[PDB]
Structure formats: structure tokens, C-alpha cells
């Protein structure tokens, strides 16, 4: 079976990231406003409507996001933090989630909502066999957002709540979460600490974000003991080093786990221009990485397959990082990457020695997943 | 004597970068149109913003740019090159300057003037000792120009005219122009490959732009063998890797080779947040580097030191880095970095031994600077 | 029966209108560049995405925009005038199409082309009986486009692409193009100058655009005398003028002709809050005009009406006038205007003496309609 | 004597006006947000930019803003009005001023200062025989802004700031505030409502902003009955009606009252090209207008002409406006409006009957000016 389900919601693209660059603008601080926040909805967006323009769209099954309910996010989060949510959106204007950075505006739970529920819907579909696989473009991101908290502009952790359904609503005794956005999944790591029966897996630049998360060491803990994996990797980390993390660990690990289902928290701030990481990874990375990930899911749980969106940065970039997954999964290959000669040229295609090593550090931990 | 002079003229904020990402926004190639080029004058505009509303314009001395003549171009670039500018900026548009990427707007050689102009024009004032250092914050910037072209958003070779001018003009016997900025200076390198008598130093990453330029091999030739030096750097190099490049090659060569007056090619795009390379360097890594480099050119030429800007295209971070080295120059620290505990646990602070090992290559090439 | 056909293409927020604010960005004239030119596509994309994130969409039949092929093109143009807008097109960066205003990147051809097909695509389903109205929102704009020339930002004419497509495909004998954006439809009037079987109707501000266009005694000619109605009006109209317009000359007009099919010129130029005229007309003014338009459709050729987007300037408020529009052809009247107090305290519901006597200078002229 | 100075300050361009259009973006309203809202501190930075860039700068003593302190701000507001300014700018977000709509960042009251006291500076050096004359390109703008509280974007009224430190600081007698911004000074109307000693005067659009206020009715109370007039004009009123009001009532209402000193607050949103009002005023206009009031000056108070700058919305147009007041100032006529061909054909240009007797409404009021 071949259908590839598709989930972009407008408000997707309405997320009101402020004035600031990062965190707000501040006078005395003398940070002045910008138009653009580096996490501004407009990245995601375009990687959108290159789907669209570039014909992708026509190989795809437009699935609605349909709102996370409270019963889907509990599955996640606790009632305080939803309480907490609910809480800052019914302010007048907004506010601040907890953290000084991470806001929503008034009525901003709705578009978290419909982001998380886009990830449960695309879940749904796939797991009944409606659909073969998808890919939910949703906004804003999740894996920063632990049990307890909004975190690193994430409101809602939505493969979490995803998995969440997968356990909990459609049965599934094992679902893997593969988190290849450059930062620490350390929300996704926080919510299934004590729990085998979702393996977790974040690849990432070494104390990116947050600061002191995403050790090797941080291994689980009870019953999920062995069944949360980081693999930390040095800056300046390019397609070598991420195929051989891929090869040597991820698809290793997923084997030995066997999963009902993989769902994969997909960031492109690994990309060779994002600002927010210094990796090297290529469009033609991220297709390669795909590539893998789908084919290990057709071996091991009947291609069962849901693409999440998580954080990249680059509004030039990553449309076509974006675009090369997606033909992944259409397996319609018809736009070449138009940066791929100039960025080809700087590196990263080497696996430089402390790039091995960091992988290899991982590779013993493999024999811990039953 | 302690006047520190400070060139900003308004038509640097005017630049016309276009529509595109990087290279031209692209129908065919579906590269959607965006406000902001990478390379947007707001980036510096923001640099030159921060300088007054933090105050330190009230320790600076404001030096207007004069127009770089014919005659001043020309001690850098060939007539051909000066007269395909004309020819393309007299066009009732603009054009291509040559390489399909570098465009200049109908009259946008007013603002090329203007910017190899204003380098020009505090070296000038700080030759003859009417000012004892300064910081030219120009735009376009200069240093891929070789003889011959415009390249990588450089119009002409702004350092390298100033060089041509305490050359010819001041008739000085020895200039040093040091770039870190992280692209490779190919134009500086090129224009004054022959020639012993400006000493050309550039830091960056390796291969990172241009595409095979910067090698270590590249050492001049004819008289000028030994006076070209470069210093490639492996992605990932941070504050510690910078700093052991100033005081184990850069340093050592300008104490070595005596110049009479030291132009800084002074780029941000090592800063840890920007999108068009992967290093590591912060603010406090700027200010270090600021420092000692000062410092070196009270020992060696009666603190004669001329900044020049160059690349960098974090707008959120680059002030910042930008405010550092200001701040070095009026002695008046009086605004923190915002960014600094954010990006400090990120790492770079180590010096790995690769970034040692790529550091010590250039050490033996200290001996043949005579 | 009801079914409301709606285009929406994703190229048409792709159309590059440059660094400029309506002629190019120009330094010796110092006409800074700017990163929103007046006629962006984010107006349009905004009117787009409130369709969908008000849920009209949802009542709304999502109709694929199909290129215009040059026969469809030659309805409405000349052989010269295609021609010239593939050579513009086909240049490497594309050009002037001629007027020094109105400009094409490479590829541009190809959004051309989904315009007037997106119009033609529409016009055939609802001419069919598969839809009962629609609206298609598309980019570039059509009206000024004359026979033989690009103009004022209209590469073709849209809704005489789609006129000439009901005449000839069709073979509709009476057609009418409807035109309310607040520019003279010079274009529209120049194409059907002649003929009969397209009655054009414009309303606008007496000399906006184009200046020495539009006024009352343009009539056609030869068997096309009596078949092109102006309706200039002055600076400051608002409800109670355009109302008057619809009531006294535009539905009477119809009534008179029995056109097969209704086309509007729909613009939203004319709103309260344009840049680019001195008109007052609210979403609520835009409600009633349409209204209006859609029940005389039904009671004179079976309610087939199609919207073509023109101009309009606001990208604040233009999407409020534009969905007013759609909520009258879905029924669906699911969201208020924001706007509707703070803009119903400025004027405009008055019908002053002036604003009425422009408007009867038209009455006598509806009796050479046979 | 002349000596015209100049008012700009960085911080002018940082006012943060948020997301929003003219409220705040809105979900459930479906106000999707914007990186520009209306009034974006952008426009009135362009003017500034282009003073420079056309070289006017050269012609201009710059002026450094000098914060207004308590003292400055309380002869024109309450105690409880800059209590509660401090206030919400000491808030940690900072916040509504009350209106619903202006808003002040953490610190934003620092800006809000300079903006007055860039006006009462100007004032000091006109008033004491520095300066002859000259233009506080200030922001945020003040003639909204009534005794007790904000309004209309208006932290305080800087020009009744300046007005009350000429009456109280400087001793002069009678000061008049000839206000040209398309909106109703309210605010200046309210403060010296009871007052004889500032005669206020606000040409605007009738019912433009605010809604019900500037009635020509509304004549001030007690010894100021007959010393504040307003001249409301219709919905597309152009050159002729603003220079036909200028000859009729504001330059015969100046030469019968005598003021030590004119205040102009000097808005350009009465322009052709305005979304925030429906004049039709060009930059020939705006120049005409300021020569009369400038000779009026040297005729009647020995040219001591202050132009504080209020409002403005078009950042295309708005900058040429401008330059031509600032041409008028300097006598140096060195640049073209570039729009003057384009605009010109439009109208505004011949006094309609409305526009005439709009005005003459207000002749009578003259007699009652002693
Ligand atoms: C802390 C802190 N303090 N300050 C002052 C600032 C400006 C801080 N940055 N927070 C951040 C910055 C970036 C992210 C990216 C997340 C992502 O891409 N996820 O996948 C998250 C949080
Ligand atoms: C080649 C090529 N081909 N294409 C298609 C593209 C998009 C290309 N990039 N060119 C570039 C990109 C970046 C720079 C930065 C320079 C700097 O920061 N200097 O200090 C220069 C040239
Ligand atoms: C001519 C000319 N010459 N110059 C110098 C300039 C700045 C010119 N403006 N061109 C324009 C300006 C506006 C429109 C609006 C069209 C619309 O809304 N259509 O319905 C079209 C052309
Ligand atoms: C009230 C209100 N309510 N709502 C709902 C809205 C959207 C409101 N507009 N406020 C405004 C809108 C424009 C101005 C322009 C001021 C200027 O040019 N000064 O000279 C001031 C206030
Ligand atoms: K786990
Ligand atoms: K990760
Ligand atoms: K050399
Ligand atoms: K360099
Ligand atoms: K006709
Ligand atoms: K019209
Ligand atoms: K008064
Ligand atoms: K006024
Ligand atoms: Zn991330
Ligand atoms: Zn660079
Ligand atoms: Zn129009
Ligand atoms: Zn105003």
C-alpha cells in the first residue's frame, strides 16, 4: 500500500513569535525589535508552499489537523500545565508560558492544539492503514516541552502526545520516537523517562540547547532503564557523522526495539545554513537519513511511518531539506537541491575521528534495549 | 593620544541586495522571493544603531566618507574592473557584475565609493595621527574582490584600497591587513600576491567561501613569497581556537614583519549564531581578539589600527559582537552582551586538538616573514 | 443549486515585485528600497489564508487553476504582446514589459498564465452548471492590461482572458465584465472597444490610474457604441456613492444587456484604508455590493457570477473586504469586521450631492444598451 | 540669522509597535499577525535617512534630543498621567497605557522622553537666538494625547510640552501650535482648552480620528473661548483646499493673535498616498504649506518656526514630504519628488464648493482672536 498523508493548517503559519530576536526585544538590554524572530512561523511556511509550488502536493493526501482535545494532551502533559496553557491563551492579551522566552498569544492554545493534533491525526491514519506514511508540517514545535512545562518555543510535546495515542487509544505496546532536530529532545527524554514502552531517541548537536541536557548517561530510569538514547555529536557535524549515528545506532536500536509504529521528531536546524546550529547536514543528508528510516520501518512494522516537524531556521534552506523528505515518501524526485553544489564544497562529508568516537560511545547501550 | 574615529554613512543601509536568498530569487528553480538576502544591509545597519543608542557614539569621533576616486580604486583593482562598475551601475538598472551572484543597483557605485572611501579616509586620519585607531562600519563589503572582479558581495577591495593609499600616498614601506572575517580574504590575497609589501593574514573557515581557496600552501609568490598567510580553522572553532590563532600565528607575524599601520578586515560571520558559517566565536571572543590586537599595535606602530568591516549576517547578534570591539577601542564598557550566558554553555571555550593541530601548521611560515 | 467554486494557486504570493515601492528602488533619485512593494503578493496570500482560517473554506469547492495556453491568451491580446511576454520571461532575469513599471522575472510568464487560467478554469465550471458562482483570487491583476501591452501591473487581462473563453468556447453571446476596483479598467475597455457581445462596465476614481482615462464620454465605438459604461466618481466616495453606482447605473445596466454571464473586476482599492486611493468603501460596502451582483445574477442569466481579484493595496484590511465577498456567495456569515466600528465613525454614508450628480451623468447612457 | 536645526535620535526608530495592524493581532478575530503594523517606527526613519542621504544633513545643525524631565512633562499632563506611563513602562512587559491600543515596552517611557524633549530642545535654541528656525523629527508622535492620559500612539503631547516650556521657562506670553496632521489634535485642544496663552489650531479631516471631535463648534472655555480653532475639511481635499485654508484662516488667525513663537506639529498623513486618512496632499503641497508658515514666521515673530513631527503613514511617500519641509527650512532645493508626474494627474489640485465653504465656516471665528 502507497498513500502518503499530508497535514499544513493554516494557522501553522499565524504563530505570533513577537518582536523580539530570541527572547523579546528589550530596551534597556538596547536588543532592538526585528519583523523577524529567528523561530518566525514564515520558515515552516515555505517549506509549505514549496510542497505546493513544486507539484510534491499532487503526490499527497491533505490530511485536516483536528485540535488536540484535553484528553489527548494529558496524555502528555499534566493537568497543570494544560490548566497553565488554557490559563495564559485566556489572558486578554497572552503571556508568558513559565520560561521568559516561550509565549502564546490570546487564543495562541488554539493553533498548539491543532499542531499537536496534527501529529495525532496523521498517527491515526497511518496506524489503521489508511496511510502508508506522512509527513505533519506543523507549528510550533514540541520536543523542548517536558511533562510539567512549555519549553524552547514548544507549547505541547506533539509526538509525544502522538505516542501518547498510539499507547493508549489504538493499543500499541511499543512506538519509537527518532528525534533529529539538532537541539536536545530533552521534553520527549523527560515524559517517557520511567517508560520502556516508548524508546527515545534524539541525535544532536552536544549542549546546543538546552545547556547541560542530552549526556549519553541519560539512559531512563525503573522499568525504562536502556530505553531513552542520546547520541550527542561534536559542531561542524555534517552527512558523515549523521549516517554513521543513522547506521551504527538509530537503526540498530530500532531494530532491536522493534516498534509498533516510528515516529520521527523532524527538524532541518542541522542544515549546513541554520543560525540556530553549526552542523553541515545537506538537503542531500536529510534525504539519505529519510530514506533509511522509511525503508527500516517497511522492514520492521509495516512501513508504519509519521514524520512530525520540529525546529529549523533557515527560511532560504530549509524548504529544500524539507522538500527531499517528502520525495522520500512520494518517492517522486522532481526539484533538485539548488544550493547542493555550494554547500557540497564546505565539508561535513568526512567522518572526522571525535565524530566516530561520539557515535561509538553509544554503540554498547545498543544491547540494553529488549 | 587616544581619538578613536567612527565612519557610518547612511547609503551603506541602502544597499540593494535584491529579492533573493543568496543568489536571485529563482521561478524555475522554485526559490521563492523573500525581503530579507542573507546578506541585507540591516545586519550592519543594526551594528551601526547599537553604537548610539548604547552611547558609545559620545566616545567616538565621527569621520564622513569621502568618495574613493578613480585613482584609488585603481591602486587596487584594474581599469577594466573599474570601468565594468561604471558600465554596469550606469546600465538604467543595474547588472551582474560578473559572477551571477554580486549585483549592483543603477548608481550603486555611489555606495562602492563611499565604502572603500570611508576605509580609506580614517586610515588617512589615523596615519597622519589626527586619530590614534578607528572602526570604518562599511558596506559593501570587500575582501573576495581580487584585481580583477567583483565576487562574493564585494564590489571593490576596500582594505586593499586603503593599503594602495598609506602605500602610494603615505608612502609606507610595510602594511598588514588581517582578516577574520570567516570566508577566506581570496581578492586581499590575490591583489597583493607579488608583493612583500602589504602582509596578508586571513582567518577562516576552511573552504567555506570560496570553494578550494585559503590552503595553507597559498603563500604568494615572487617577492611576495611568505607574505600571504592563511589560517584555516575546522568547523566548530570557537574563542579558544581564535584565540590560540592570534597569539600562536597572527601576533607572532605582525610583530615579526614590523608593519607601519594594521587594517583589521573586521567580519562577525565567526559568531555563533551566524547562518553562513559554523564557528563558534562570541562577543567576549571578539572583544579578546579586539584587544590584542590593539595592544600589538601600540608595541609595534604607535597604535596605528584601522577596522574595517566586513562580513557577518546574524542581525540579532552581530551588534553585539560589533559593540565589543567598539568598546575595545573607546575603553568605555558599559553594556553586557544579552546573549552571553545563552551562548557560553554552548561550548567552543576547549581547544580541541584538531583545531591545535590545524593552528601549529602555520607556525614554521612565521620564520620566512622577514 | 449551490456549489462556490474557489482559486487560490500557490505561485500567485510568488509574484516578485521587486525592492521598490511602486517604480523601481533608484539612488540618484534616493527612492530607498524597501522590503514591501505596494502591490506585494502578501496582500492577496493574507486574503487567501483568512479564507482558510475563518473556515470559509470549508464551504468552499477548491478548483485547480489551469495555465491559460496562448490560444486562450489571444481571446484577449495580440500575437505581439504574448510574444513579447515570453521573450520577457524567457530573458535570464527577466524585464520591463514595456511600460517601465510593470515587470516579469524569469519564469514570471508561468504566474501570468495561472492567472487568466485560474479565471478561465472558474468561468468554465460555473458556465457549465458543475459550480453556481465563485471566486478566484488571483495574481498578477488584469484590467489596465490593454490588447497589445502590459500595464500597471497586469501582464494579461484576466477577465477578458475568461470573456473571450465564454464567447468563444462557450459560445455565449452577451457577457459582462463588471469592474469595481478604483482604478479605470482602461484595459477591459480598450479590448472590447468595438464589440457588443462584452458589455464593460468600470467604476473608479475619476483619474487615479491611469490619468486621462476613464471618463464618461468613452463609449466604444462602431457596433460597440453603447457597450462600455464609465462611471468616474470623485475622491472621498464611500457606501452611499457606490451603492447609488450599483443601484442607478450598474444592475440597471445588466438588466438592460441579458449577459449569459456576469464577471467581476472585484478589487478592494476602493476600501476605507488604501494607499493607492482616496475612496471609502467598508467591508460592509463591499457586503452589499456583492450581495447585490449575486441576486441579479440569479434573477437575469441563472446566477452565473464570477469574481476575478484585481487590485487593492491594504494587506490590514483588504482581507476583511475580501471575505464579505465570500460570505455572501457561501451564505456563511461567520466572522465580523474588525474594523467595522472605528472605520463606520469616518464617513461615506452619506450620499452627498456631488458623489450623486457624477453618478446621473451615466443614467441617460443606459438607454442606448440594446 | 541662519541656523536651522535638526532633531533625530536612534531610539526614535526602535519604538516597538508590536504585531498587530493598528490593534493587536487577534486569533479570534482572525487579526493575523504583521511585521508591519501602520504605525511602524520605519517611516518616519526613512525621512530621517533621506535628510542624510540627499545631503540636506550638511545643510542642518544636528540637535541631540535631551530627555524631558518630570517637570518638562507636568506643564502639559497630570501627575497621574506620568505616574501611570512610569508605571507601565516599569512593568516587566510593560503595557496598555488604557486606550486598548498604545502601548509601551519595559522602558519605553525612555523614548517617550526624548520625544518630547527633542521637541522642547528645538524650542530652547529657536526661542534663545541660537537657531533661527527648525524640524524634531521626533517619535512617538503627541497631538492626541490629552491632559491625563495617552491616545492615538500618543505617550505625551510633545508640542504642548514645548509650548508650556516657552510659557513657563522661556516667559513668553503667546506661543500657537499650528497643527497639519490629518487627525484632530485632541489632545492639544484639551490641554489649552481654558487657555488664551497657546492658541491651538488643527486642520484635519472631518471625523477622521478621533471620532465625534474637531468641531469647528469646539472653540475652548472661559478666558480661552475663541483661542483654539479647528478646520475640519472633506474626504479628499487636496493642495488647493489646504493652501486655500492656509491663506484664509490659519495664516490671517496667526498674524491676529502674535505669537512669540510658532509650534507646527507637522504630520504628512493628510498625503495622496496616506492609508490612515483620504487627502490628497503632495510634496509640493506639504512645501507650500511650510513656506507660508515660515514667512509668516519672519513677518510676525521674528522667524521663530518649530516643526515637531507627528504623524505619517506611507513609509514610499511620507519621506519626500518631508524633505520638502526641510527643503523650505534650509532654502536648498536639491532633489525632485519623484512621484510629483504620477501624483499631479490625480486632483486635489482645483478648490471644490465643499472644500470651500468647509473653510469659510472658520473666517468668522477670526474676529474673536484678541
Ligand atoms: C535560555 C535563553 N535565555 N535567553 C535570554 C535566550 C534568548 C534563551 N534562548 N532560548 C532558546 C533559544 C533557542 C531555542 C531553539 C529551540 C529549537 O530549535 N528546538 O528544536 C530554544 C530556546
Ligand atoms: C557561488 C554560489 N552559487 N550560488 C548558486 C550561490 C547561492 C553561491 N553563493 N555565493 C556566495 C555566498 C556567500 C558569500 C559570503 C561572503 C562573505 O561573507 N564574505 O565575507 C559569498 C558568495
Ligand atoms: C505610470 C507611473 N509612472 N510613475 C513614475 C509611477 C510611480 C507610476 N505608477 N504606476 C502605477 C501605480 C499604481 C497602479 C495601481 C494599479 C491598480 O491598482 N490596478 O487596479 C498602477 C500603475
Ligand atoms: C480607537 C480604535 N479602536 N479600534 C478598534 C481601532 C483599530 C482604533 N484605532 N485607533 C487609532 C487608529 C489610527 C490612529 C492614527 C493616529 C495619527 O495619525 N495621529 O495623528 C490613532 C488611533
Ligand atoms: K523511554
Ligand atoms: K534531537
Ligand atoms: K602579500
Ligand atoms: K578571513
Ligand atoms: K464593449
Ligand atoms: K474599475
Ligand atoms: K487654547
Ligand atoms: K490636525
Ligand atoms: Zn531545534
Ligand atoms: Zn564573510
Ligand atoms: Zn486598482
Ligand atoms: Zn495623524
Given at each position: 500500500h502507497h498513500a502518503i498523508g499530508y497535514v499544513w493548517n493554516t494557522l501553522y503559519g499565524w504563530v505570533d513569535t513577537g518582536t523580539g530576536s530570541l527572547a523579546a526585544a528589550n530596551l534597556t538590554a538596547r536588543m532592538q525589535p526585528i519583523?523577524?524572530?529567528?523561530?518566525?512561523?514564515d520558515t515552516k511556511r515555505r517549506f509549505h508552499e514549496l510542497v505546493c509550488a513544486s507539484g510534491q502536493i499532487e503526490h499527497l493526501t491533505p490530511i485536516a489537523a483536528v485540535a488536540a482535545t484535553d484528553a489527548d494532551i494529558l496524555r502528555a502533559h499534566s493537568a497543570a500545565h494544560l490548566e497553565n496553557m488554557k490559563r495564559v491563551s485566556n489572558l486578554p492579551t497572552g503571556g508568558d508560558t513559565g520560561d521568559g522566552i516561550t509565549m502564546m498569544g490570546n487564543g495562541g492554545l488554539e493553533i498548539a492544539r491543532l499542531s499537536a493534533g496534527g501529529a495525532v491525526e496523521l498517527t491515526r491514519r497511518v496506524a489503521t492503514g489508511e496511510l502508508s506514511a506522512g509527513y505533519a508540517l506543523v507549528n510550533p514545535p514540541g520536543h523542548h516541552a517536558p511533562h510539567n512545562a512549555a519549553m524552547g518555543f514548544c507549547i505541547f510535546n506533539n509526538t509525544s502526545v502522538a505516542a501518547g495515542y498510539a499507547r493508549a487509544?489504538?493499543?500499541?505496546?511499543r512506538v519509537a520516537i527518532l528525534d533529529w532536530?539538532?537541539?536536545?529532545g530533552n521534553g520527549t527524554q523527560d515524559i517517557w523517562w520511567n517508560d520502556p514502552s516508548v524508546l527515545t531517541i534524539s541525535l544532536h548537536q552536544?549542549?546546543?540547547?538546552?545547556?547541560?541536557?542530552?549526556?549519553?548517561?541519560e539512559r531512563g530510569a525503573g522499568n525504562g532503564h536502556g530505553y531513552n538514547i542520546n547520541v550527542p555529536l561534536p559542531p561542524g557535524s555534517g552527512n558523515a557523522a549523521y549516517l554513521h549515528a543513522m547506521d551504527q545506532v538509530v537503526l540498530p536500536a530500532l531494530r532491536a526495539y522493534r516498534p509498533q509504529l516510528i515516529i520521527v521528531g523532524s527538524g532541518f536546524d542541522a542544515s549546513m545554513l541554520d543560525p540556530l546550529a553549526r552542523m553541515m547536514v545537506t538537503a542531500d543528508g536529510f534525504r539519505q537519513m529519510a530514506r533509511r528510516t522509511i525503508d527500516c520501518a517497511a522492514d520492521i512494522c509495516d512501513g508504519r511511518i509519521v514524520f512530525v516537524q520540529e525546529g529549523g531556521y533557515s527560511p532560504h534552506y530549509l524548504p529544500f531539506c524539507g522538500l527531499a523528505v517528502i520525495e522520500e515518501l512520494t518517492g517522486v524526485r522532481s526539484l533538485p537541491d539548488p544550493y547542493h553544489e555550494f554547500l557540497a564544497g564546505?565539508?561535513?562529508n568526512t567522518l572526522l575521528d571525535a565524530e566516530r568516537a561520539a557515535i561509538e560511545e553509544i554503540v554498547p547501550l545498543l544491547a540494553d534495549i529488549r
Amino acid at each position: 500500500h502507497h498513500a502518503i498523508g499530508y497535514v499544513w493548517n493554516t494557522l501553522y503559519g499565524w504563530v505570533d513569535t513577537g518582536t523580539g530576536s530570541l527572547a523579546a526585544a528589550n530596551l534597556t538590554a538596547r536588543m532592538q525589535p526585528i519583523s523577524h524572530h529567528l523561530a518566525h512561523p514564515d520558515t515552516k511556511r515555505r517549506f509549505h508552499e514549496l510542497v505546493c509550488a513544486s507539484g510534491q502536493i499532487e503526490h499527497l493526501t491533505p490530511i485536516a489537523a483536528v485540535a488536540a482535545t484535553d484528553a489527548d494532551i494529558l496524555r502528555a502533559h499534566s493537568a497543570a500545565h494544560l490548566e497553565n496553557m488554557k490559563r495564559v491563551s485566556n489572558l486578554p492579551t497572552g503571556g508568558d508560558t513559565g520560561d521568559g522566552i516561550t509565549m502564546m498569544g490570546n487564543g495562541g492554545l488554539e493553533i498548539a492544539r491543532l499542531s499537536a493534533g496534527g501529529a495525532v491525526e496523521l498517527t491515526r491514519r497511518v496506524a489503521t492503514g489508511e496511510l502508508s506514511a506522512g509527513y505533519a508540517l506543523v507549528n510550533p514545535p514540541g520536543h523542548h516541552a517536558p511533562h510539567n512545562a512549555a519549553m524552547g518555543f514548544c507549547i505541547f510535546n506533539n509526538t509525544s502526545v502522538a505516542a501518547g495515542y498510539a499507547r493508549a487509544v489504538l493499543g500499541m505496546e511499543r512506538v519509537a520516537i527518532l528525534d533529529w532536530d539538532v537541539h536536545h529532545g530533552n521534553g520527549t527524554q523527560d515524559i517517557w523517562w520511567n517508560d520502556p514502552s516508548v524508546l527515545t531517541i534524539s541525535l544532536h548537536q552536544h549542549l546546543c540547547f538546552p545547556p547541560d541536557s542530552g549526556y549519553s548517561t541519560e539512559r531512563g530510569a525503573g522499568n525504562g532503564h536502556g530505553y531513552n538514547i542520546n547520541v550527542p555529536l561534536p559542531p561542524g557535524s555534517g552527512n558523515a557523522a549523521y549516517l554513521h549515528a543513522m547506521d551504527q545506532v538509530v537503526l540498530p536500536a530500532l531494530r532491536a526495539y522493534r516498534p509498533q509504529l516510528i515516529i520521527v521528531g523532524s527538524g532541518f536546524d542541522a542544515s549546513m545554513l541554520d543560525p540556530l546550529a553549526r552542523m553541515m547536514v545537506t538537503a542531500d543528508g536529510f534525504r539519505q537519513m529519510a530514506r533509511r528510516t522509511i525503508d527500516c520501518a517497511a522492514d520492521i512494522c509495516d512501513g508504519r511511518i509519521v514524520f512530525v516537524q520540529e525546529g529549523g531556521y533557515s527560511p532560504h534552506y530549509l524548504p529544500f531539506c524539507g522538500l527531499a523528505v517528502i520525495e522520500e515518501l512520494t518517492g517522486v524526485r522532481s526539484l533538485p537541491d539548488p544550493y547542493h553544489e555550494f554547500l557540497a564544497g564546505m565539508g561535513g562529508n568526512t567522518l572526522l575521528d571525535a565524530e566516530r568516537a561520539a557515535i561509538e560511545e553509544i554503540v554498547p547501550l545498543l544491547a540494553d534495549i529488549r
